[PDB]
Structure formats: C-alpha cells, structure tokens
Design a protein around this ligand. Structure first.
Ligand SMILES: Cc1ncc(COP(=O)(O)O)c(CN[C@@H](CO)C(=O)O)c1O
Ligand SMILES: Cc1ncc(COP(=O)(O)O)c(CN[C@@H](CO)C(=O)O)c1O
Ligand code: NA
Ligand code: NA
Lengths: 385, 388
C-alpha cells in the first residue's frame, strides 16, 4: 500500500471494488505456475527477452573514466520497456476474465505497447490520449490503429496526459466487470505502483545476472530516466538491497529548472495527493497540477511514482536533472559513437551517465537503462537539429 | 564461385585484385577463433541475437490449417536481418585493416545497417543511393546521417539501385586499399554471394534448434521473401540437406505479373550478366535492366542471387509471387492478429504462408522468416491504405 508515507489508495468509493478485485487477483496469480509459464513464454518468444547488456567500449574510451554498459530495452518488441508491463497486465486481465483493456498514454509508447499486447491476447483495446498529445504523435497514433486499437482523444481539461488518466479512471469505474485499466507507469492507487514495478523488475534481474557474467561484480552505479518511474524501478529494484550499488534517476530539466519549463517532480514538485496516491507533483500557486515540458515526449507526467519519492526520502537513490540540450547532445553522441539511436527519454539517462563516468575511475561500472529506441523520435529531432 | 552455371566474377581487370584479397581474407578469418569470438560477441550483446521463433497461434487458428511460426528477425538491432551481414563484413573489413566502408542501398535498410556497424567499429561510412530512392526514403537517409554516415545521391542512369551499385563499384576500384565494399545481398561477383549467405546463415541455424525444441521435428515448409535473396538464403541454407523440408521463396508480384510492374526475376526474368554475376535479371529486349515495382521498397533489386537461380534449377526450392494487394492485407492482418507490425518485404512471405497454411493439415508446420519490422514502412502504409 505505502512506501514510507508515500503511495496509498486515496480514491472515491466507486474505485474500491475494482482495486480490491485487482489486488486479490494479483495476489492469486503473481506466483501461479500456469500464469508464469505463459508470461515467460510471451516475454521470451514474442517480446524477445532477455535483452542484452552492451559494453559501450568506444563511448567509455572517449570519455576515459568508468565503463559504461547499456541495458538494451530498446531491443524489446515494440521498441521500449513498456511492453514488459503491457504483457504482464494484459495476461493478468485475461486470467481475470476481462475482454477489454484501456490505457492512458502521452508519448504514445504505452498506448502502442497496450495495443500490441491486446492484439496478442485478443482483447478489445481503447487508448485514452489527450488531444494535444494525439496531434503531436501522429505515427504512434497510426501504429495503435494498425494494431486494431481505438484511440479516444481526450478534449477535457488541459487535453494532455493527466486528463487522459482522469477519463480512463471514469471509464474503468463503469466497465471493470469486463475491462482492465492498464496503467503504464508505477503511479496511481495501490496496487498499481507495485504491479508495474513487479512487471518491470525483469530488467534488473537480467542486468544483475549479465553484469556478474561480464565483469564478475555488481555495478557501482545504475542510471535511468524518470517519467512516472517504471523503467527506473524496473532496473533499480533488484539492486535495492545491494549496499555497494548507487541508484540515480534522471528527470527532465527541460529549458532549465529556473525557466519553469521542465518535468522534474522530485527535484522541484510538492508532495500532494493526486490520481489516488500521495507523492511528488508539479503544481502551481493555486495548487492545481501544472503543465510539464521536455523535448522527450515520454517525460510528460506531472508527478512521479511513490516508490521513488520513498527511495529519495531515505536517500537510497539520488535524483538529478538533465536539460533538453544535454539530452539532444547525448542522442547524437550515442548514435555516432556506438551506432545505437536512443529514445529521447533514454538520452537523458545517457547524458547524465556521460557526465558521471568522466568523474569516475576506469575500474568502476555504470549501467544505463536504455528504455527505448529513437525511431519514434526522428521527426522531433529533424525539426530541432 | 559457381552455383551450377550461375555466379562467377564478371568484372573489369581492375577489380580482380580487390576480389582476390577479399577471398584470401575471408578464407583466413571464416574459421579464425578470434574473428568468430568477436563476431558472436557483437551479434549477441549489440544486435540482440538469438532472435526468437514465435508461434502465431491466433493467426494459425483463424486460418484453421497448418501451424505458422515466425522467425523474428524484426527484433534484431536496426529492425532487419541486414544487420547480421553488416556486422560480419564490417568486422571482416576491420580485420583486413580497412578504415572505410561503402555500400549501396535501395530501401535504405542496408544503408542504415551499414552505418550502424561502421559507427560501432569506428569506421568511416559512405552509402550510395539512387536519387529517386533518396526521395522516397527521407527517414532512412536521416538515420544514416545520425549514425555519422555520408549519403551520396546517385544522379546517373535511372537514379535507382542498379545505378548506385555501379557507382559503388567505381569507387571501390579507386579505393580498395583502405575501403571495403559491403554488399548487402547474396549478389555481386564471387565471393560476395557466399559470404553474405554465410553471414545470414545464423538465422536458419537458430530457427532449426528453436523448432526442434518447440515441436520435436523439422518444419514441413519454410517461406521467405526474396529481393536479392539474403534473408531467404540465411534461413534456407542450414535446411538444404534436409530432404523433408520444402523451401519457398516469395517474389514481389507488384501490380501483377501480366502488368509487367513487379520485381519477380526468377518468375519472369531472363538469364543475364550484371553486377559481376551470371543470374536471372529483369531485362528488356535490348539487354537493358528494367525498372522494378513493388509496394515493398526492399524488393527493388532487378535481379536475384545466383544461389537462388541454382536452387530453382535443381528444384530444391520453389519460387512464387505475391501481389502488392496481398502483401498489404497480410501486413494489416499480422498487426491485428498477433500485435507484430511486419516490414512490407516480409509481409510478402506472410501472405504466401497464410495461403499455404489453408491448404495444409493442423499437424503440419510452416516457418516464415520475418525479415524486418514495419516501422520504416508506416508512411507508405498511411499513404496507400489511408488513415483510419
Ligand atoms: C521510451 C520511454 N522511456 C521512458 C518513459 C518514461 O516513463 P517511465 O518513467 O514509466 O519509465 C516513457 C514514457 N512514455 C509514456 C508517457 O508519455 C507513454 O504514455 O508512452 C517512454 O515511452
Ligand atoms: C527489411 C527487408 N527485408 C527484405 C529485403 C530483401 O533483401 P534480401 O532478399 O537480400 O533479404 C530488404 C532489402 N532492402 C535492401 C534493398 O533495397 C536495402 O538496400 O535496404 C529489406 O530491407
Ligand atoms: Na514528472
Ligand atoms: Na528481383
């Protein structure tokens, strides 16, 4: 329920029944032999797990400090980590007898992943997406439809990610007998922050195994970008009890923190209650939720997961920011130097890892979670660069 | 050098030295333990091999005949099988002491693969691309640029793939001491068609272990699309000596064979000599290479590799065609039924397998090589199928 003070389940009474059924089903299926056989079978033969851990030798040499390894979630079916959680939850939904999935999306990547998993298991899929975001993600919207999903543009409020979540929640309240709301990050009311993190943890368990094989030891640092915080919790969580391993989450600095055009909830947001949870949110002087900005469309959620707020508060992980300009420089550098075109979200983690490696010893190890590939971001990079 | 009467090395004398050195080097390194340790290393940690073999149960059941498995080359780094050969040849180049790679590309996929492998290995990269292909493939051109490669638009001739290969050959003549010409299909003068097949063979070796593991037996049929022939050679070759296993190559039927707008060299071309090889080409009465058509950008080469001409000749493999319309329907169908968006090239193989499956027993097994993912093809599909 809670991570320290954060998280919880602060929702109208109409949400209580769906959430308790979900928790009950999850408790029942998460260790069910049959459910796991099927989940691993799809993650293996359809998504292509495990993903490799890649030693970025040229990058490491050029910077001339710590060894930089990349956990290659860009190679997952779909092009991003989102797929791990979409498969997990869609299968859960199927085991509970649901026939339809809904999900919110901002950048379109979780919408695409959800559509994919829906098509895979033969469920109807409706994706709520703010109309401002539908307009900026033309090709992800088209992918979703090719996959047989319907895209419902959300015209209420600020027409953006928070608003799509709101409508998704209203729908679920009416339709949960046959619908599962497939939340895309480690946010929302219990049990979603736990479920999503459980379904992303596969990343860290692979990465731990792979780095022991490659180097005979655990990494000195793991670096991941933080929107809502799923890919970061995914790779962090299996290392939480390893005292040697530093954990660094990188948030969107946008045009700079001072500019007020960014998406850095942990660094510059306030603690508050929204979307059924107590965590950090970016809000105005009136207290209402504030619009975010980043060149990375996936770093758009105006809050962060509670388990991160918790890891911050107990100082188990550190949270930093990287600006638009720095992320873009990193997108280019990784492309030219290692022949890997990263997602612009993931480029934030790369840029921070680049700065940190420089200060570190050649004997030390950084693992960078490469949350996604950059194909989806080409139009954006074309326009700016 | 020869696959029955097909193949050879039909080049001006200037190119004999480069091809000689390459042949020497490939023989040396093909079995070098260090070369192979490094190659396997990059294929695993950077390219993401092995790719899985996926049972399309929903597709299979909807069609109600044979089981359809998909070899998922769409999951390889870069999104197509091209990467396997690109890494192989770029490594070979680097072991030969070369510092520059050149390549030709039509669809742009091999250009991208070449740029990626050159970036990986710290080599300079120039890609030749017909100006008409450049215009149709802005995003792949942009990808190549981002990867640090230089794209050279070819304005001579038809301004298309054949012309890019001609320009690449002239470059290599002048620059072979330090440059390697990274040919992207099982085509060109010996030793290229052997080498590329050898480097794509991993696909079939995987698929073979994976199917024994999933089903305890070999497939009844393997279906792959055929442009130049590399993805098909890759998956066919380790099964050639398994009498049981049918091999089916699928060529682009375009607007239909009777229309003359297609790219079916084996089905409707002639024996000819271009690009240093004796094989089947689409060429007119005055011996000139014809323009090709397909909705799939990567099925644009106006010929086919000599090893395919050989298999057709001895009847080890059958070669069919699928139209644009059939390929498009299959593209939509795989996306909707299995949540996998295929490349339009690979959709030709899928469309054929769907037809074959219908005519087969539920006991039987078809492996389809899914040569690439459809991300690169979304603008084409948007334009042709329309928005939804
Ligand atoms: C490739 C990639 N990397 C990182 C993130 C950030 O989210 P996370 O912090 O849950 O991992 C996203 C989020 N993308 C979400 C929010 O916009 C989506 O709806 O698509 C992403 O698509
Ligand atoms: C995804 C995909 N699948 C199949 C093929 C056909 O080539 P093959 O028959 O050599 O495998 C191509 C070729 N594409 C070549 C020729 O245009 C290129 O230069 O990119 C492809 O890109
Ligand atoms: Na945020
Ligand atoms: Na052809």
């Amino acid at each position: 329920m809670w991570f320290g003070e954060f998280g919880g389940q602060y929702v109208p009474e109409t949400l209580i029944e769906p959430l308790k059924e979900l928790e009950k089903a999850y408790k029942r299926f998460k260790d069910d032999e049959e459910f796991n056989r099927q989940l691993n079978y799809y993650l293996k033969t359809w998504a292509g797990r495990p993903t490799p851990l890649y030693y970025a030798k040229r990058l490491t040499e050029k910077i001339g400090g710590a060894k930089i390894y990349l956990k290659r979630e860009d190679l997952v079916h779909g092009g991003a980590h989102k797929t791990n959680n979409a498969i997990g939850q869609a299968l859960l939904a199927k085991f509970m007898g649901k026939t339809r999935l809904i999900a919110e999306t901002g950048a379109g990547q979780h919408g695409v992943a959800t559509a994919m998993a829906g098509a895979l298991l033969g469920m109807k899929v409706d994706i709520y997406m703010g109309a401002e975001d539908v307009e900026r993600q033309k090709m992800n919207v088209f992918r979703m439809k090719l996959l047989g999903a319907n895209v419902i543009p959300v015209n209420s409020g600020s027409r953006t990610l928070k608003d799509a979540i709101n409508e998704a929640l209203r729908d679920w309240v009416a339709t949960f007998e046959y619908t599962h709301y497939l939340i895309g990050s480690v946010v929302g009311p219990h049990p979603y922050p736990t479920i999503v993190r459980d379904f992303q943890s596969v990343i860290g368990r692979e990465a731990k195994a792979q780095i022991l094989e490659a180097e005979g030891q655990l990494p000195d640092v793991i670096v991941a970008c933080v929107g809502g915080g799923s890919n970061a919790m995914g790779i962090f969580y299996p290392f939480v009890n390893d005292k040697k391993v530093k954990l660094v989450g990188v948030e969107a600095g946008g045009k700079g923190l001072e500019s007020g055009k960014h998406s850095a909830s942990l660094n510059a947001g306030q603690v508050g209650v929204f979307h059924g949870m107590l965590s950090y949110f970016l809000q105005d002087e009136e207290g209402q939720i504030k619009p975010t900005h980043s060149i990375a469309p996936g770093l758009d959620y105006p809050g962060v997961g509670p388990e991160h707020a918790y890891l911050k508060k107990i100082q188990r992980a550190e949270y930093v920011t990287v600006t638009d300009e720095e992320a873009l420089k990193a997108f280019h550098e990784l492309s030219r130097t290692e022949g890997i075109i990263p997602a612009l979200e993931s480029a934030h983690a790369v840029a921070y890892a680049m700065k940190l490696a420089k200060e570190m010893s050649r004997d030390e190890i950084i693992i960078v979670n490469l949350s996604g590939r950059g194909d989806k971001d080409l139009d954006i990079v074309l326009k700016v660069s």
